[PDB]
Amino acid sequence: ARECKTESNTFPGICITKPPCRKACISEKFTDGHCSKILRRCLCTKPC
Amino acid sequence: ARECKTESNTFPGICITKPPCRKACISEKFTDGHCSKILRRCLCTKPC
Amino acid sequence: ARECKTESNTFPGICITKPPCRKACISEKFTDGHCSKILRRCLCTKPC
Amino acid sequence: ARECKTESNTFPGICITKPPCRKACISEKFTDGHCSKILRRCLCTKPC
Amino acid sequence: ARECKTESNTFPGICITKPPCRKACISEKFTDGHCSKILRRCLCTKPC
Amino acid sequence: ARECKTESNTFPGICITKPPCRKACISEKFTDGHCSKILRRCLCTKPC
Amino acid sequence: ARECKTESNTFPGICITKPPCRKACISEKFTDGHCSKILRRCLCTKPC
Amino acid sequence: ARECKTESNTFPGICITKPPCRKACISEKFTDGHCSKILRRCLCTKPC
Amino acid sequence: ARECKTESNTFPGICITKPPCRKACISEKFTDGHCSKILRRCLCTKPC
Amino acid sequence: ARECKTESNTFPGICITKPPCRKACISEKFTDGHCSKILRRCLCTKPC
Amino acid sequence: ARECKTESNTFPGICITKPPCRKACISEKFTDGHCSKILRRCLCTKPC
Amino acid sequence: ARECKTESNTFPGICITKPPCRKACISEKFTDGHCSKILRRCLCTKPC
Amino acid sequence: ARECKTESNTFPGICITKPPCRKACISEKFTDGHCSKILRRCLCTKPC
Amino acid sequence: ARECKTESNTFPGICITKPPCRKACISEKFTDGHCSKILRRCLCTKPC
Amino acid sequence: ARECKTESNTFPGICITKPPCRKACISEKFTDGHCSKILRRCLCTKPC
Amino acid sequence: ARECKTESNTFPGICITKPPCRKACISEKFTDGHCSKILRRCLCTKPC
Amino acid sequence: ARECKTESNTFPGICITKPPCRKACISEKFTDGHCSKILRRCLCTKPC
Amino acid sequence: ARECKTESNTFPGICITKPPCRKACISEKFTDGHCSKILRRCLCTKPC
Amino acid sequence: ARECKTESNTFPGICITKPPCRKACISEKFTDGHCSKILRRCLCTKPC
Amino acid sequence: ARECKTESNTFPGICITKPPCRKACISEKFTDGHCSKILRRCLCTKPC
Ligand SMILES: CCCCCCCC(=O)OC[C@H](COP(=O)([O-])O)OC(=O)CCCCCCC
Ligand SMILES: CCCCCCCC(=O)OC[C@H](COP(=O)([O-])O)OC(=O)CCCCCCC
Ligand SMILES: CCCCCCCC(=O)OC[C@H](COP(=O)([O-])O)OC(=O)CCCCCCC
Ligand SMILES: CCCCCCCC(=O)OC[C@H](COP(=O)([O-])O)OC(=O)CCCCCCC
Ligand SMILES: CCCCCCCC(=O)OC[C@H](COP(=O)([O-])O)OC(=O)CCCCCCC
Ligand SMILES: CCCCCCCC(=O)OC[C@H](COP(=O)([O-])O)OC(=O)CCCCCCC
Ligand SMILES: CCCCCCCC(=O)OC[C@H](COP(=O)([O-])O)OC(=O)CCCCCCC
Ligand SMILES: CCCCCCCC(=O)OC[C@H](COP(=O)([O-])O)OC(=O)CCCCCCC
Ligand SMILES: CCCCCCCC(=O)OC[C@H](COP(=O)([O-])O)OC(=O)CCCCCCC
Ligand SMILES: CCCCCCCC(=O)OC[C@H](COP(=O)([O-])O)OC(=O)CCCCCCC
Ligand SMILES: CCCCCCCC(=O)OC[C@H](COP(=O)([O-])O)OC(=O)CCCCCCC
Ligand SMILES: CCCCCCCC(=O)OC[C@H](COP(=O)([O-])O)OC(=O)CCCCCCC
Ligand SMILES: CCCCCCCC(=O)OC[C@H](COP(=O)([O-])O)OC(=O)CCCCCCC
Ligand SMILES: CCCCCCCC(=O)OC[C@H](COP(=O)([O-])O)OC(=O)CCCCCCC
């Protein structure tokens, strides 16, 4: 029931809102995505 | 008695006013929603 | 799945290492526990 | 390589050197482990 | 013919983009919806 | 019920007093008319 | 006296001037309302 | 269903963890308490 | 030699960079797209 | 029936009332014309 | 100008400000209390 | 193709309507001209 | 002499410093590039 | 009296506050416990 | 295997997202690249 | 038994071994003394 | 009575707490393990 | 000749002086080793 | 199989070799004695 | 296979040369002896 995390490699530009990062991360065969707090990076998550 | 919390997967845009976040969170099968103070993100809530 | 988060009420002192906060969260009928990055608060996580 | 990350559940104490974190992460069925640069936390990794 | 407008009753929060305001007005049995320039309210429009 | 609003397409000049604007709006098949507060435009109102 | 506060759940748009927010808050069975300083939210107030 | 909110009158110092603020708020005849995110104030909550 | 404008009805989220808004506007059978200045709305353009 | 918009290029002066802008826009082979809210520019509209 | 010092055994949480520690220390039948500078421990004091 | 922009060299005064700014830009051997949304600067455009 | 400017259509990520934006713009057949102040966009420039 | 010390073999994690180390040390049939200054080791003491 | 590290020679500016650093590092005959946490340097990696 | 602590008033010089510090503390109406770890200060102890 | 020591071949990383060093040394068919005071290495001891 | 770096995985304890770390690195098929400045980690180096 | 530790109260001077400190600790009703590493104090040990 | 080490209990005086310490160590049922580099203590070694 762990949540593994890695940075998106297909997300363009600044990560401001969640649905775009979640959509790109799901496209990368992950389950969810969210933005980082400081550098606005789109992080992909999936169970592991 | 204890409120659990997670970020909304469907809420678009910046979380400014509460009602739009509560509506998106209730649609996601939660009991309420609210914005984060700093990053302005829609956080869904439900009893743990 | 979705991960829900809430602050623990039994963890004493500052949260430095994860196992102690994880232990108190499992004691609080949760799945995992981790420390916050700035104020070092013990946060309990579990499926929503 | 692209690596998924999650914090070690079993690693005790401050993460200073890599081998102790790697040892706990491998025991948790992960490929490797490393210390976070700032907060000094043992993060487990596996290919993604 | 002429276009009559009135404030929406189901649109929550601040009117930023048009599709959300336009969708609520159609559910309110109007033909179109647009955001007010200043106060950012959802104005529903239909033929008079 | 709700009040639908549209500008007058027959009122000439500045909208200073109410009776002339109401009189023009009733001729335009509306129930009432009033002046806008800043630009002094004659506005016609009727039930939606 | 001690005043309790909550954000309005009926106020549409951004909060520029006080009277529109005060009106919505009073319809919500509060005694007054005012605009937040930065994000221009409508905050309702009433004695606790 | 409305959560009224006001700052605690008995909580001393800065609000870091929830239990100390919730404890002081219940002693003030409120149902819960939490820390403000930025100013770290202790805010008491009860149904309006 | 004039350009017709309308807001996108398929663009997701906030318009920061141009290429994403141009791509969504082309899918809506326009020729180009650009962001609004403040509210960051994706505006579609095409020859009138 | 999406509405495409462009600024008038024959309207002289400042757009206060709608009839002058609508008449100028129809002479420009558009279906309607309305004033902008702040700068009072005449804006022509027609189906996209 | 001497004070006998011992660590508090009732102070919960992090010791950032003086008031919370001094409050818990007086309840422990001491006269004052202050926080340690690094680990943020509550230290009670009383005249020797 | 791609459109490059630069502020006009000859346009006198504040840029409110488009036709005046378009004339000055064409006189400067550019294609079109438009106003900036904030400082109201006349911006000339031509293919990059 | 006169500097013509457009936004890059190839620059990936946040524009914090100049050299990364300058390198992308030269590949785009421009001569220089700089970052926007607020949203940190890469803007390419070249002589008109 | 004469006081002897030995490192605790049951205290988990980092020794921050005294009560956890004291409780673990008394569990080991000792009389008191405190933390070392630098490495934060839980040291158990008892009459020797 | 183990990963050797060295700072990229061709990476301009600071390292924000991974794909830019990975691309420059691969062109320098390395297998991967990532950003340093604090100084935001592009560090090229290859098996060792 | 709870132990109170303060630095000696009369201990001459740098605290290295225990007996000299204990002697000065017993003279100062305390029960025992010991050296601090870093600055090597003689610290007197007695029950609170 | 007499005791001989040697460096541990199994203990990884820095030697902070005694139990992990004793556990590795017992696994190396020694009777006890402890950390060297300075270089913080795990030393294995057994009857000599 | 560009040099590559990897943290040692056999060096015991903290890294105070170079020779002990350099010796462990050569046994790891590297050419040299040195201590990190703050956390005193043994870092192995060899030509890339 | 657990050694308790206390500083000698009879050994004079600095502790260089083991036999002298060991002898002084035997007279103090202890099993063994050894020097501290840096300050060269005589430490007496006996089973807990 | 492994060299176990302990301090000699028969060597008198300073340890300047190896042969004198080796002779005393061999007399103590050991294989070899050597001087410590700073304190000049005679240390006996033998297979573990
Ligand atoms: C200096 C006092 C304040 C504490 C600094 C803490 C640094 C920190 O939080 O690093 C993480 C942050 C990147 O965040 P993100 O990539 O997860 O969005 O950091 C960065 O992006 C790195 C740059 C940090 C600022 C420059 C170095 C001092
Ligand atoms: C002008 C300074 C005024 C005082 C600032 C101090 C406020 C404060 O305590 O912030 C801590 C907050 C929550 O911390 P934690 O519970 O996650 O450890 O964590 C954060 O604020 C970080 C999360 C937000 C990330 C975006 C920061 C730009
Ligand atoms: C020929 C000169 C034209 C400009 C001078 C008058 C400005 C103006 O048009 O204000 C009125 C207009 C809407 O008013 P109305 O059409 O409802 O009467 O728009 C507004 O109410 C704009 C409000 C401006 C303040 C915004 C910040 C709170
Ligand atoms: C000590 C006096 C107060 C200053 C420190 C407290 C920070 C603070 O009040 O943040 C401002 C703002 C709050 O919005 P509002 O709901 O109060 O209108 O919310 C935000 O900041 C939202 C995030 C974006 C940052 C501001 C952008 C303009
Ligand atoms: C006095 C200096 C002001 C400088 C900025 C001027 C305001 C401005 O240009 O607002 C643009 C925005 C329209 O959104 P957009 O679709 O054009 O991005 O319009 C609005 O958001 C209208 C409501 C603005 C309310 C502001 C309240 C503080
Ligand atoms: C250097 C600072 C300059 C600030 C004033 C900017 C003036 C300006 O361009 O306002 C016009 C803009 C849109 O007007 P319009 O083309 O719809 O008539 O209006 C809007 O976008 C709506 C908001 C206007 C009022 C803003 C009050 C904060
Ligand atoms: C590898 C293990 C890392 C452990 C990290 C935590 C150590 C630490 O914070 O020690 C604090 C201690 C006293 O702190 P306090 O309780 O007075 O706030 O220290 C001092 O007051 C002395 C200052 C530091 C002197 C020694 C430097 C290592
Ligand atoms: C190639 C660089 C382009 C600008 C980079 C980002 C900063 C910015 O937006 O400044 C300009 C902007 C005016 O917008 P516009 O009317 O020029 O489109 O903002 C203002 O008008 C505010 C600043 C100027 C007035 C300051 C008054 C204290
Ligand atoms: C604290 C936040 C201030 C900016 C609010 C709007 C946020 C936003 O998306 O601004 C983008 C826009 C263009 O800036 P840039 O992305 O080109 O650097 O920026 C502007 O046009 C800003 C103009 C501000 C003029 C103010 C004059 C009083
Ligand atoms: C480069 C500086 C080297 C300092 C260490 C050498 C001296 C040493 O180890 O002294 C023993 C001390 C034990 O402290 P404690 O057991 O009383 O908490 O342990 C420490 O003080 C260990 C601190 C080492 C921490 C280094 C960063 C991880
Ligand atoms: C920075 C200016 C010089 C140091 C001033 C003293 C700072 C201070 O109050 O440190 C006290 C603290 C605890 O020492 P002790 O009472 O446990 O021996 O920890 C220490 O004494 C650790 C610091 C030792 C190293 C001093 C600077 C080289
Ligand atoms: C003056 C102390 C704070 C600044 C230390 C120097 C800044 C720095 O390089 O931080 C990163 C550094 C990495 O250690 P190393 O692997 O390079 O030895 O080490 C750390 O991140 C460890 C932080 C040390 C303080 C820990 C809390 C007491
Ligand atoms: C930066 C990390 C390391 C800082 C010092 C850590 C504490 C430390 O090593 O204390 C023990 C040592 C003497 O101990 P001992 O010989 O009495 O057992 O030393 C002292 O008593 C400390 C006195 C200060 C001078 C130490 C010189 C090596
Ligand atoms: C205030 C007292 C300062 C130290 C004075 C005493 C030094 C001392 O006794 O050094 C020898 C001893 C180990 O010696 P030996 O048993 O290997 O011959 O211990 C050491 O080698 C410890 C070296 C000191 C720390 C060096 C920096 C980490």
Residue numbers in the entry:
A (entry chain I), B (entry chain K), C (entry chain L), D (entry chain J), E (entry chain F), F (entry chain E), ...: 0 to 47
Task: Tell me, in the authors' exact words, what the paper reports.
To address this, we determined the crystal structure of a NaD1–PA complex to 2.5 Å. The ten dimers are arranged in a configuration that results in the formation of a mildly curved, carpet-like structure which we refer to as the membrane disruption complex (MDC), with two such 20-mers forming a large 40-meric ellipsoid complex with a total of 28 PA molecules. The MDC comprises three small arcs comprising three or four NaD1 dimers, respectively, in a 3–4–3-dimer configuration. Structure-guided mutagenesis reveals Arg39 as a key residue for the cooperative PA-mediated oligomerization and fungal growth inhibition. In contrast to wild-type NaD1 and NaD1(K36E), the NaD1(R39A) mutant lost the ability to form oligomers with PA, while still maintaining PIP2-mediated oligomerization.
These small (<60 amino acids), cationic, and cysteine-rich peptides can be expressed constitutively or inducibly, and exhibit broad antimicrobial activity. A key function of defensins during innate defense is their ability to permeabilize and disrupt cell membranes. Recently we demonstrated that the ability of certain plant defensins to kill fungal and tumor cells is dependent on the engagement of specific membrane phospholipids, which trigger the formation of large defensin–phospholipid oligomers.
